[PDB]
Amino acid sequence: MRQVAIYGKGGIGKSTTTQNLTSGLHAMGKTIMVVGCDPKADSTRLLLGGLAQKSVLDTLREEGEDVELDSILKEGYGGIRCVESGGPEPGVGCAGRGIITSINMLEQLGAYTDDLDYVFYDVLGDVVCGGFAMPIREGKAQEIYIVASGEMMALYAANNISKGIQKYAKSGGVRLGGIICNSRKVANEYELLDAFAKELGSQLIHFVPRSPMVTKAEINKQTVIEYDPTCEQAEEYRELARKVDANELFVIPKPMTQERLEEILMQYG
Amino acid sequence: MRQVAIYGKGGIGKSTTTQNLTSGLHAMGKTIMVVGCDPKADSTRLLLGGLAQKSVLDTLREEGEDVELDSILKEGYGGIRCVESGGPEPGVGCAGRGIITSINMLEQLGAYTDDLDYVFYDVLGDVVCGGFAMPIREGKAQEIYIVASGEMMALYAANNISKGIQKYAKSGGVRLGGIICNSRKVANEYELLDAFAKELGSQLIHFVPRSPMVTKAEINKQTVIEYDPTCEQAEEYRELARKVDANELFVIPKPMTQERLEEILMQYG
Ligand code: SF4
């Protein structure tokens, strides 16, 4: 079973990419589980159709000790099994800690079934603290893909995420499978991202194009593959899916200095 | 001395407003100290004329134990004392721990002097966790201002931040002083920001407009008052300052429901 995690700054469509990627993997005959660990994004909404399914932390406080799997895991588009961690008690508590609670409650309720081809953790990368690195540090996530756009703050976060990955790439076997560009503009910043990823010693595994369809599917609470399998954008996601599935490039990333960041920005951005 | 914290999500210029606000109070003969607690932007880079001061954490790493106050606190614009707590070691440290370390050092090095009119903690609003609630939790900050814009994610963060505020108001002196709008070109933004702040039991203390004045000053790494004092945007900040200094509305905020917020973003465009 591939235990993948998608990290990246908020505000750049990271959860939408993660969800769309799974439909692409489903289009390949894959059995997949998705676990949202992003208190700022609905991680399974495009897969379950507008249903902001109830979180694990929320189910506990009501289903208490007798919680049943089917309450926390809902089957979405194409059979993709969907779950949501739920955030930290506002102002107290640790998101990282609650992502741990949920994951352990999943194993405990036997959610990690031998038919799983994939499990994805959609993790917020705004704060790259020990709380958000929980899935990597605990061995839950071995293969990470970072989502970034050709903007400084998304590149900075990606670099930072790689710093955290790097620290665990040793004791554990977590590695970076690649960077995914979520084009946020008409300016195809393919070259910046490609340079940024190669500099880490990784690769731009796929460049997700700016499309007005992502927005339609989204309004309609669906992934582009559920909403309209025939468009170009649908093929984009199928292509991202196949490259992740076929991927053999797994590395201990080499973070860059801020200065190096700036140089890449100038030379390729 | 007024102990204020400025919370808000990143990506909407919260730190630029913090620095610009202090500038205004400087204009009022106010003696001020700024403590950056936000991994996202440089909370003092505009006060220090574009100077990226080392952080408390960097510094301690460097200067070790023998930490000098003058190394960590730098006087910038009009005498404003600047300090940056430094972010967490990527993948390991909790953002809160560093905040507490820094505040203790400042206290230990006698930075909390009698001549202080204000101390501001510029804090990240992306995750309303205990790590980020450290200035509040440690008692340090009793007066809160949340920076938001018409964007939905900004209002959600603001609402989420108010939950954390309320967790401590009812037992600590912590109160919400108001909502500050960093305008993001939103149709009917003002009426919307005012209904939101009102919904919480608070007020839209000031609407900061977008102007090419801010983008210029930050290319040079200055605050606007500093740039052209005669300038409406610099005057915008002076008004912001006199409105905060004279403020008398300080409340235990009433977080609204997700449905209550979506209603408002429906009713207000
Ligand atoms: S480790 Fe991170 S999520 Fe946990 S309390 Fe600290 S800053 Fe917050």
XYZ file of C-alpha atoms and ligand atoms in Angstrom:
546
model
C 0.000 0.000 0.000
C 1.435 3.380 -0.894
C 1.207 5.754 2.119
C 1.357 9.130 0.431
C 0.941 12.662 1.877
C 0.286 15.917 0.039
C 1.756 19.013 1.668
C 1.656 22.628 0.598
C 0.712 26.182 1.559
C -2.971 27.056 1.869
C -4.706 29.184 -0.734
C -3.234 27.580 -3.839
C -5.759 24.815 -4.441
C -3.816 22.033 -2.789
C -6.847 20.040 -1.515
C -8.551 20.338 -4.892
C -5.405 18.924 -6.539
C -5.154 16.079 -4.052
C -8.823 15.145 -4.639
C -8.564 15.398 -8.385
C -5.410 13.280 -8.312
C -7.275 10.408 -6.543
C -10.070 10.326 -9.205
C -7.232 9.954 -11.741
C -5.838 7.018 -9.692
C -9.366 5.574 -9.420
C -9.589 5.894 -13.205
C -6.618 3.451 -13.081
C -8.364 0.773 -11.090
C -6.837 1.902 -7.743
C -8.505 1.396 -4.350
C -7.770 4.505 -2.255
C -8.361 6.057 1.171
C -8.185 9.839 1.742
C -7.612 11.394 5.210
C -7.943 15.156 5.531
C -5.454 16.649 8.018
C -6.038 20.209 6.860
C -8.098 22.279 9.314
C -8.282 25.014 6.601
C -9.533 22.863 3.698
C -12.394 20.543 2.989
C -10.281 17.502 1.958
C -13.061 15.103 0.748
C -15.865 17.484 -0.313
C -15.252 17.183 -4.065
C -15.294 13.438 -3.569
C -18.394 13.091 -1.449
C -20.313 15.911 -3.128
C -20.743 18.948 -0.906
C -21.065 16.771 2.161
C -18.725 18.274 4.687
C -18.578 14.890 6.425
C -18.181 14.996 10.188
C -14.673 14.765 11.625
C -13.093 12.090 13.789
C -12.509 14.506 16.619
C -16.170 15.510 16.299
C -17.425 11.922 16.179
C -15.453 11.078 19.324
C -16.996 13.840 21.368
C -20.482 12.421 20.400
C -20.090 8.728 19.537
C -17.667 8.644 22.449
C -16.072 5.342 23.203
C -18.303 3.245 20.931
C -17.340 4.918 17.637
C -17.846 2.837 14.522
C -15.747 3.122 11.321
C -18.686 3.832 8.939
C -19.314 6.995 10.936
C -15.836 8.337 10.198
C -15.247 6.843 6.738
C -17.644 7.621 3.859
C -17.415 6.227 0.326
C -17.252 8.803 -2.382
C -16.833 9.175 -6.086
C -15.546 5.923 -7.533
C -15.499 4.188 -4.179
C -12.699 6.433 -2.771
C -12.963 6.059 1.027
C -13.016 9.481 2.675
C -12.236 10.577 6.288
C -11.591 13.930 8.034
C -9.331 14.443 11.059
C -10.840 17.637 12.364
C -8.891 20.607 13.806
C -7.549 21.479 17.312
C -9.664 22.930 20.148
C -9.373 26.551 19.173
C -6.588 28.290 21.068
C -5.606 25.112 22.931
C -4.497 21.738 21.667
C -2.364 20.686 18.775
C -3.527 19.931 15.217
C -0.620 17.525 14.999
C -1.898 15.676 18.028
C -5.428 15.294 16.635
C -4.140 13.998 13.256
C -2.443 11.286 15.383
C -5.699 10.490 17.246
C -7.622 10.032 13.954
C -4.962 7.928 12.240
C -4.689 5.618 15.238
C -8.524 5.420 15.432
C -8.482 4.459 11.769
C -5.946 1.616 12.221
C -7.693 0.603 15.416
C -11.065 0.318 13.641
C -9.200 -1.624 10.978
C -9.499 0.917 8.159
C -6.175 -0.083 6.523
C -7.542 -2.960 4.512
C -5.331 -5.152 2.258
C -7.171 -3.979 -0.846
C -5.901 -0.429 -0.468
C -3.648 0.644 -3.336
C -3.270 4.086 -1.720
C -3.847 6.221 1.363
C -3.340 9.965 1.148
C -3.023 12.439 3.914
C -3.946 15.947 2.764
C -1.823 17.997 5.187
C -1.636 21.754 5.683
C 1.832 23.123 5.095
C 1.259 26.671 6.413
C 3.006 25.940 9.646
C 5.769 23.397 9.160
C 5.947 22.565 12.851
C 6.266 19.261 14.635
C 2.511 19.091 14.838
C 2.050 19.009 11.037
C 5.033 16.726 10.507
C 3.312 14.147 12.681
C 2.425 11.681 9.779
C 6.027 11.731 8.523
C 7.661 11.419 11.968
C 5.322 8.563 13.045
C 5.907 6.572 9.834
C 2.332 7.025 8.474
C 3.507 8.889 5.396
C 6.507 7.559 3.447
C 5.985 9.159 0.070
C 5.365 12.939 0.008
C 4.463 15.250 -2.865
C 4.507 18.986 -2.323
C 2.094 21.300 -4.082
C 3.360 24.698 -5.077
C 2.590 27.568 -7.399
C 5.202 29.868 -8.915
C 4.910 32.329 -6.105
C 7.506 33.107 -3.439
C 5.424 32.139 -0.339
C 4.412 28.786 -1.873
C 7.987 28.155 -2.896
C 9.198 29.125 0.595
C 6.706 26.736 2.242
C 7.781 23.939 -0.153
C 11.404 24.512 0.802
C 10.457 24.473 4.479
C 8.435 21.279 4.108
C 11.484 19.696 2.519
C 13.535 20.792 5.573
C 11.164 18.764 7.775
C 11.121 15.833 5.347
C 14.937 15.895 5.297
C 15.138 15.516 9.077
C 13.112 12.351 8.991
C 14.587 11.063 5.775
C 17.133 8.860 7.685
C 15.661 7.523 10.915
C 12.618 6.711 8.856
C 12.397 6.152 5.155
C 10.232 9.129 4.279
C 11.213 10.627 0.934
C 10.020 13.336 -1.487
C 8.434 11.833 -4.630
C 8.117 15.234 -6.279
C 6.696 18.771 -6.507
C 3.327 19.474 -8.178
C 2.713 22.919 -9.689
C -0.831 24.316 -9.315
C -0.617 27.025 -11.925
C -2.299 30.027 -10.383
C -1.932 32.128 -13.505
C -1.803 32.366 -17.258
C 1.959 32.698 -16.962
C 3.137 29.108 -17.217
C 5.831 29.116 -14.476
C 6.843 25.623 -15.513
C 10.483 26.599 -15.797
C 10.645 28.203 -12.309
C 9.046 25.150 -10.666
C 11.146 22.736 -12.674
C 14.315 24.534 -11.538
C 13.107 24.767 -7.934
C 12.411 21.059 -7.775
C 15.609 19.945 -9.434
C 17.521 22.194 -7.034
C 16.078 20.162 -4.117
C 17.231 17.106 -6.000
C 13.640 16.273 -6.842
C 11.452 16.787 -9.920
C 8.333 18.663 -11.142
C 6.331 15.438 -11.484
C 3.457 17.322 -13.157
C 2.290 20.845 -13.936
C -1.436 21.349 -13.204
C -2.785 23.971 -15.660
C -5.055 26.861 -14.851
C -8.476 25.797 -16.107
C -11.931 27.291 -15.810
C -13.229 23.718 -15.442
C -11.597 23.176 -12.036
C -13.818 26.022 -10.857
C -16.991 24.511 -12.437
C -16.413 21.046 -11.032
C -15.671 22.703 -7.738
C -18.862 24.778 -7.684
C -20.626 21.547 -8.494
C -18.902 19.808 -5.556
C -17.102 17.338 -7.844
C -13.707 16.519 -9.237
C -13.127 17.256 -12.932
C -13.125 13.542 -13.551
C -16.551 13.010 -11.976
C -17.874 16.257 -13.426
C -16.657 15.955 -17.027
C -14.323 13.079 -17.964
C -13.991 14.333 -21.549
C -12.214 17.668 -21.124
C -8.497 18.406 -21.444
C -8.289 19.179 -17.741
C -9.618 15.724 -16.913
C -6.717 14.253 -18.896
C -4.295 16.502 -16.938
C -5.365 14.717 -13.716
C -5.198 11.312 -15.289
C -1.658 12.155 -16.390
C -0.644 13.327 -12.872
C -2.075 10.022 -11.527
C -0.097 7.771 -13.870
C 3.220 9.578 -13.156
C 2.738 9.187 -9.390
C 1.821 5.525 -9.854
C 4.781 4.882 -12.147
C 7.174 7.106 -10.091
C 10.521 5.606 -9.062
C 12.215 8.954 -8.180
C 12.255 9.045 -4.361
C 14.744 11.280 -2.563
C 16.072 12.775 0.711
C 15.630 16.403 -0.417
C 18.307 19.055 -0.216
C 16.736 22.277 1.160
C 17.958 25.622 -0.230
C 18.946 28.877 1.353
C 16.564 31.830 1.055
C 19.287 33.428 -1.119
C 19.304 30.417 -3.362
C 15.512 30.741 -3.561
C 15.837 34.352 -4.809
C 18.377 33.418 -7.413
C 16.122 30.712 -8.825
C 13.263 33.249 -8.744
C 15.306 35.676 -10.878
C 16.909 33.170 -13.284
C 13.750 31.194 -13.982
C 10.764 33.032 -12.513
C 1.401 49.810 28.882
C -1.078 48.358 26.416
C -0.364 44.710 25.529
C -1.889 44.118 22.092
C -1.811 41.132 19.696
C -2.577 41.407 15.988
C -3.926 38.077 14.617
C -4.971 37.210 11.082
C -4.396 34.766 8.257
C -1.443 35.217 5.995
C -1.621 36.385 2.438
C -3.697 39.475 3.175
C -1.020 41.854 4.478
C -1.607 41.515 8.188
C 2.055 42.348 9.080
C 2.242 45.292 6.791
C -0.773 46.743 8.670
C 0.783 45.969 12.078
C 3.943 47.887 11.188
C 1.956 50.652 9.575
C -0.258 50.911 12.648
C 2.769 51.212 15.050
C 4.113 53.952 12.736
C 0.910 55.854 13.369
C 1.219 55.523 17.128
C 4.780 56.638 16.836
C 3.284 59.720 15.219
C 1.380 60.072 18.467
C 4.393 60.379 20.728
C 3.807 56.756 21.609
C 6.789 54.650 22.654
C 6.392 51.131 21.188
C 7.884 47.632 20.981
C 6.983 45.039 18.244
C 7.413 41.287 18.703
C 7.138 39.170 15.549
C 5.554 35.743 16.224
C 4.676 34.981 12.636
C 6.614 32.563 10.522
C 4.867 33.867 7.360
C 6.212 37.388 6.902
C 8.852 39.647 8.383
C 6.977 41.528 11.089
C 9.698 44.211 11.329
C 11.363 44.391 7.986
C 9.453 47.657 7.190
C 10.264 49.296 10.526
C 13.909 48.414 10.172
C 14.019 50.206 6.801
C 14.215 46.865 5.023
C 16.581 45.275 7.521
C 15.903 41.542 8.195
C 16.997 41.316 11.841
C 18.080 38.007 13.256
C 15.550 36.277 15.458
C 15.729 35.427 19.099
C 16.033 31.754 18.183
C 18.729 32.365 15.521
C 20.527 34.667 18.062
C 20.407 32.265 20.956
C 21.779 29.594 18.581
C 24.485 32.118 17.703
C 25.199 34.220 20.881
C 24.341 31.065 22.904
C 23.386 31.887 26.495
C 25.162 35.250 26.739
C 22.286 36.924 24.862
C 22.466 40.702 24.695
C 19.267 42.786 24.483
C 20.760 44.992 21.754
C 21.313 42.038 19.526
C 17.644 40.984 19.493
C 15.869 44.333 19.873
C 16.628 46.890 17.170
C 15.330 50.429 17.152
C 13.774 51.211 13.792
C 11.338 53.777 12.592
C 10.936 56.665 14.992
C 12.290 54.678 17.880
C 10.160 51.545 17.477
C 11.804 48.612 19.269
C 11.722 45.567 17.010
C 12.112 41.915 17.811
C 11.398 38.666 15.910
C 10.921 35.457 17.968
C 12.105 33.230 15.130
C 10.116 30.307 13.740
C 10.344 26.624 14.805
C 13.075 24.272 13.495
C 11.128 22.850 10.463
C 9.355 19.552 11.229
C 10.294 19.612 14.934
C 9.607 22.744 16.915
C 6.226 24.110 17.998
C 5.731 27.720 17.000
C 4.590 28.472 20.528
C 7.695 27.315 22.335
C 9.771 29.910 20.532
C 7.287 32.616 21.245
C 7.576 31.889 25.015
C 11.352 31.635 24.909
C 11.580 35.071 23.231
C 9.153 36.767 25.524
C 11.047 35.364 28.556
C 14.370 36.608 27.199
C 12.909 40.096 26.565
C 11.544 40.088 30.116
C 14.831 38.739 31.531
C 16.840 41.348 29.582
C 14.614 44.079 31.026
C 13.023 45.105 27.698
C 9.656 45.561 29.393
C 10.471 49.046 30.505
C 8.411 51.701 32.262
C 8.518 54.037 29.310
C 6.494 51.544 27.214
C 3.144 52.712 25.870
C 2.504 49.662 23.721
C 3.806 46.160 23.096
C 2.421 44.429 19.929
C 2.719 40.728 19.137
C 2.297 40.157 15.374
C 0.818 36.594 15.300
C -0.059 34.046 12.547
C -3.844 33.332 12.269
C -3.671 30.298 9.897
C -4.005 27.673 12.665
C -5.779 28.536 15.897
C -3.772 26.132 17.940
C -2.246 26.407 21.422
C 1.203 27.094 20.019
C -0.093 30.262 18.391
C -2.217 31.249 21.361
C 1.008 31.608 23.470
C 1.040 35.392 23.793
C -2.546 35.169 25.054
C -2.092 32.042 27.177
C 1.043 33.486 28.798
C -1.173 36.457 29.843
C 1.142 38.726 27.746
C -1.531 40.118 25.498
C -4.953 41.271 26.676
C -6.100 43.431 23.716
C -6.755 41.773 20.311
C -7.251 43.062 16.820
C -7.910 40.655 13.943
C -6.948 41.611 10.381
C -9.379 40.254 7.750
C -10.577 41.126 4.230
C -13.739 40.357 2.280
C -12.277 36.985 1.193
C -14.134 33.992 2.707
C -11.032 32.203 4.058
C -10.039 35.467 5.886
C -13.407 35.733 7.598
C -13.296 32.056 8.495
C -9.818 32.533 10.079
C -11.073 35.623 11.860
C -14.059 33.709 13.200
C -11.813 30.777 14.190
C -9.403 33.204 15.909
C -12.309 34.679 17.867
C -13.103 31.163 19.280
C -9.534 31.006 20.664
C -9.970 34.529 22.036
C -13.153 33.533 23.818
C -11.474 30.443 25.338
C -9.478 32.779 27.513
C -11.562 35.927 27.905
C -13.862 34.166 30.407
C -11.057 33.759 32.962
C -8.323 36.078 31.704
C -8.634 39.713 30.802
C -8.321 38.967 27.090
C -10.761 40.951 24.988
C -11.310 41.562 21.287
C -10.778 45.261 20.458
C -11.888 45.096 16.876
C -11.671 43.927 13.304
C -9.380 45.734 10.885
C -10.051 45.278 7.206
C -7.098 44.956 4.853
C -9.062 45.545 1.671
C -8.762 42.958 -1.048
C -10.979 44.554 -3.697
C -14.234 42.956 -2.642
C -17.662 44.075 -3.848
C -19.440 45.656 -0.867
C -16.432 44.885 1.371
C -17.107 47.570 3.926
C -20.766 46.612 4.692
C -19.653 43.008 4.796
C -16.725 43.597 7.176
C -19.011 45.694 9.412
C -21.746 43.047 9.593
C -19.152 40.423 10.382
C -17.451 42.399 13.187
C -20.946 43.258 14.468
C -22.091 39.661 14.324
C -19.222 38.855 16.775
C -20.237 41.656 19.072
C -17.333 43.776 17.906
C -16.586 46.595 15.423
C -14.872 47.310 12.097
C -12.428 49.708 13.761
C -10.780 50.710 10.491
C -10.992 49.846 6.764
C -7.529 49.998 5.241
C -7.877 50.630 1.445
C -5.536 49.267 -1.198
C -3.364 51.943 -2.742
C -0.266 51.826 -4.873
C 1.313 53.723 -1.938
C 1.717 50.507 0.082
C 3.300 48.506 -2.751
C 5.896 51.227 -3.311
C 6.883 51.754 0.295
C 7.412 47.962 0.663
C 9.545 47.753 -2.464
C 11.778 50.198 -0.578
C 10.974 48.372 2.678
C 9.416 51.363 4.490
C 6.089 52.093 6.172
C 3.991 54.714 4.421
C 3.921 57.394 7.124
C 7.713 57.106 6.864
C 7.647 57.495 3.056
C 5.261 60.360 2.384
C 3.671 61.581 5.650
C 1.576 63.862 3.473
C -0.155 61.091 1.531
C -3.596 59.828 2.167
C -2.500 56.268 2.891
C -0.055 57.536 5.582
C -2.916 59.553 6.985
C -5.024 56.325 6.792
C -2.597 54.788 9.285
C -2.564 57.789 11.570
C -6.367 57.594 11.778
C -6.006 53.828 12.410
C -3.674 54.645 15.336
C -5.807 57.304 16.915
C -8.797 54.987 16.603
C -6.955 52.157 18.364
C -5.446 54.370 21.084
C -8.850 55.923 21.917
C -10.700 52.659 21.655
C -13.113 51.731 24.444
C -15.019 48.767 22.940
C -13.300 45.608 24.177
C -15.353 42.457 24.077
C -15.575 38.790 24.835
C -16.352 37.841 21.169
C -19.310 35.680 20.079
C -18.060 33.302 17.391
C -20.776 32.721 14.795
C -21.783 29.448 13.173
C -20.447 28.347 9.789
C -24.041 28.750 8.581
C -24.191 32.160 10.177
C -21.053 33.199 8.254
C -22.086 31.744 4.851
C -25.407 33.615 5.286
C -23.504 36.861 5.742
C -21.206 36.204 2.794
C -24.460 35.558 0.861
C -26.316 38.580 2.074
C -23.292 40.861 1.476
C -21.444 39.945 -1.748
S 3.236 21.870 17.205
Fe 2.193 23.188 15.579
S -0.021 22.578 15.506
Fe 0.982 21.870 17.523
S 0.482 23.529 19.011
Fe 2.587 23.832 18.187
S 2.412 25.316 16.375
Fe 0.399 24.406 16.905
